[PDB]
Every structure is written in C-alpha cells, then in structure tokens.
A and B are shown apart, each in its own frame.
Chain A
C-alpha cells in the first residue's frame, strides 16, 4: 500500500527539530 507520495518541495521543522534533539541528547549522554 506504499505510495511514494509528496513530490512537493517543503520543509517541516517540527520533525527535524525533534529528531535533532533526540540525537543530540544521545550524543551528550
């Protein structure tokens, strides 16, 4: 049922910030 959707060009900052924080906390831990 996979679609390979969204050929659109946009950026969602919420997901990027969450992932960056979750990686930085591991790096400092």
Chain B
C-alpha cells in the first residue's frame, strides 16, 4: 500500500549499504598498490631497464626470476634476536610470507604438429599451440625430481586459469622453492643450468601469499608468463586481498548480524513474490517492475549460495596451519571471492534502479516517467538499427585493420575502440599509418554517419514524444 513497501525498501537499502561499507574496506587499495609496485615495477637488474610488465624474451624471464623476484620475496631478517635457523621473511617488515612460493610450467610434445612434405628437410622440430590433446606427459632432461616429471591435475589440487591466449590446465611440471634466499637462488640456478624452459614450453606460473597481521587480510599473488607458439612473451598478474579469519572483532559480528538480516529480507521478498504469483495475475510479466524483482531475487540467492559455499570450504587454511613449511593453496578462495564480488556489485547496481518505482510524488515528475515509458519502444526500435550498423562497422574494422593496429586485434577490442571514438579519445595515427587509403575513409565516414545521423535521430525521437506528452497533458488540464 505505497507505504508498507516503501519503508521495507528503504530498510533494504540501508542494510545493503551497511553490507557494502564493510565489504569495501579502506586502506586496502594501498596494500595492493605497494605489492604491485614492489613486484611489477622493480627493474629486473640494476643495469637493465625492463620490468615484469615489459618482458620481451625467455632470457628476460630468467633475469627476472633470479633477480628482482628474489629481492622482493626474501627480505632482510632484521637481525636483533638469536635467529636460530632460517628465520622467516617479512616483505615490508609487516607482511609475513606464508609457506613457500611455487613455480610450475606447462609444455607441449615434440611430435605434435604435421609439417608439409614439401620442405620436410630444413624443418626438423615443431610444436603446436597449447591444447590438452597435445600436452607432454613424459620425463625430460635429468629425470631426477618433481621438476622433470609430469604430475596430474588431481595431484596438485589445481584448476584451470583462462589466461590471455588459452585456458591452461592445473597440471604441469612444478617445483616448491625454499624458505631462504640462499637456497631458492641455488634451486633456480640449478634449474637454469640444465635447460628447464625449452622451446616447447607454453606457460609458467608463480604463486605465493602473504598475511599482514596488522589488518587481518590475506593476499594471494599469482604471476603468469605465456609463451605463444609464434614466439614472444605475454605477462599477466593478479593480487587478490581475501580475508579468512572474519570473526575477530565486534564490527565483524555486526556485519554477520547484517548478513543474517539480509537473508531474512530476501526470504521475505521471495515469499511475498511467490504469494503474489500463486493466485493473483498468472501472467504478471507486462510491467517491467516484476522482471526486475525476479532478477534481484535470483542474483541475491546466487550470492548467498556462493558465500555459503566459499565460507564452509576453508579447510585449506586449517591444513596449512598444521605444517607451515608447505605451499598454501589459496586459489579457489580468490576465484570465488571475485565471483561473489561481481554478483554483489550487479545486485547493488540493480537495487538503485528498482528505487525508481517510488519517485512519482508530484506532477512534474509524472510527465518525465510518462515520456520515458512512451518512448522506450521507439528507442529500442531505433537502437536495433543503430547496433546493426555499429556491428557492421566493427566487423569491417576487424577484417581490415585487425592484424596491424593492435587496437582492432579482436572483435571486442573493435567495439571498445568504436565506443571510444565517440568520446573523442582516439589518436587518428595508427589508423592512417596502417593504411593511407581506406584508413581515413573509414574514420571520416564512421564519424559523420554515426554522430550526425544517429545522434540527431535519437534526439528527434525523444524530443517529439516529450513535446507530444506535454501538449497532451496541458490540453487535458486546460479542458478539465
């Protein structure tokens, strides 16, 4: 009754805002910033100018590993105590290094591709692109330890990654380093001496994590280097600040109570929705305010399920706390945290859109909603044509400039570039030096057509219906 629902929606808004206030804690951006600056910005060598973000060859990777990586991992021991044996390393005198970092690689098999018979004399070795069906599963080199022997995915407790080029599996040839620099450096030097990264390697992962006992917040660090079949090196990274020891302070108890209240609110909403649908209005879908309700309920249920799943499955931390000289496997937790963050973000976005149902109090706000509702159909009808022409331009750009410009290398990238052109955020250079003909022609025709015709058509469509609605309301008011 326009008041029973308004109050319980403002209460829902308050609960949701409280939930996201503690979820997005302060002094967390600086933590990730410091880690990123330490690892991805330190030059690989004093005489070198390259860092992890600009790796260019397999020889640069070896310089980075036994180099700027060990400097940031194994910090000084701050000697003021007995230092009985192999004292632990605090990365910033505050960040504890949990367990020990792990390195691993994924490679392919020599007899993978099929070179043509025409020139089968000057071509002796070949390795296809990475795939599960074309993976090496045999000992190579000095088949001595675990760095030269395949170990299945189930034995590493790993999972896929979905990198830049392909989706890499969880198996491969791995090695767990040591807790001190003087031993990890020796292990890496031994790996480099007798070649470990051959021409058949396709990917390399380095993983570790930190605690930072000051503010209780774990952080998992993963660095990936991809070696495509065509040569080169592609780096990628992720730093996920996840939390596992929630209930330590009273504010966490408050957040738990807020989560319980949120669950009760969601239960009440789903019960009232099903009660409405069971008897009243068996069609129920021609309002645009009920699809939003079911979307919100579904997203909230998914978020609650994900949260329960990733909160009950925290036995990895318990296993790690038994033996602290082993690699802590905290990748699934980070993946599920990312998924939960995305779901929470979209739900929070849709609630504020739901808020629109109640801003209709005065007459001057009724005509705007009436105009929007009346013009939505025509706006969709013209947006269909707008998107068709936009996609035609995008596919033309992808087929023409998609191999040289690095801004049209993918269909998604073409779409993003064409949206950025509307912003006036384009350089006009790589297009013209890519092709002096059909280069500027495409740009000029796109700008002219899109901007003038379609933007003015949208303006005309909105303006005509707004004027019509205003005139109709004025005539009705003056005639009554």
Contact = CB atoms under 8 A, between A and B. Distances in A.
Contacts of B131: 8-10
B163 to A, nearest CB: 14
Contacts of A7: 132-133
Enumerate the 6 nearest inter-chain pairs by beta-carbon distance, A residue then B residue, closest first. A8-B133, A9-B131, A7-B133, A8-B131, A9-B132, A7-B132
Interface in B82-137: 131-133
Nearest to A6: B133
A7 to B, nearest CB: 6
A9 B160 CA distance: 14
B92 to A, nearest CB: 42
Contacts of B132: 7-9
> Is the contact region of chain A dominated by helix, strand, or loop, or is it mixed?
loop
Interface residues on A, range: under 10
A6 to B, nearest CB: 9
Contacts of A9: 131-133, 167
A8 B112 CA distance: 13
10 contacts: A7-B132, A7-B133, A8-B131, A8-B132, A8-B133, A9-B131, A9-B132, A9-B133, A9-B167, A10-B131
Interface in A1-29: 7-10
A27 to B, nearest CB: 14
Nearest to A7: B133
Contacts of B167: 9
A8 B133 CA distance: 6
B205 to A, nearest CB: 20
Nearest to B130: A9
A9 to B, nearest CB: 6
Nearest to B133: A8
Contacts of B133: 7-9
Nearest to A9: B131
A10 B134 CA distance: 12
B65 to A, nearest CB: 30
Given A8-B131, A9-B167, 8 more contacts: A7-B132, A7-B133, A8-B132, A8-B133, A9-B131, A9-B132, A9-B133, A10-B131
Contacts of A10: 131
B460 to A, nearest CB: 28
A9 B133 CA distance: 8
A8 B132 CA distance: 7
B347 to A, nearest CB: 33
B373 to A, nearest CB: 29
A12 to B, nearest CB: 15
Contacts of A8: 131-133
A15 B101 CA distance: 46
A16 B131 CA distance: 22
B237 to A, nearest CB: 25
A10 B132 CA distance: 11
A19 to B, nearest CB: 19
Nearest to A10: B131
Nearest to B134: A8
A4 B236 CA distance: 36
Interface string B129-163: 00111000000000000000000000000000000
A9 B131 CA distance: 7
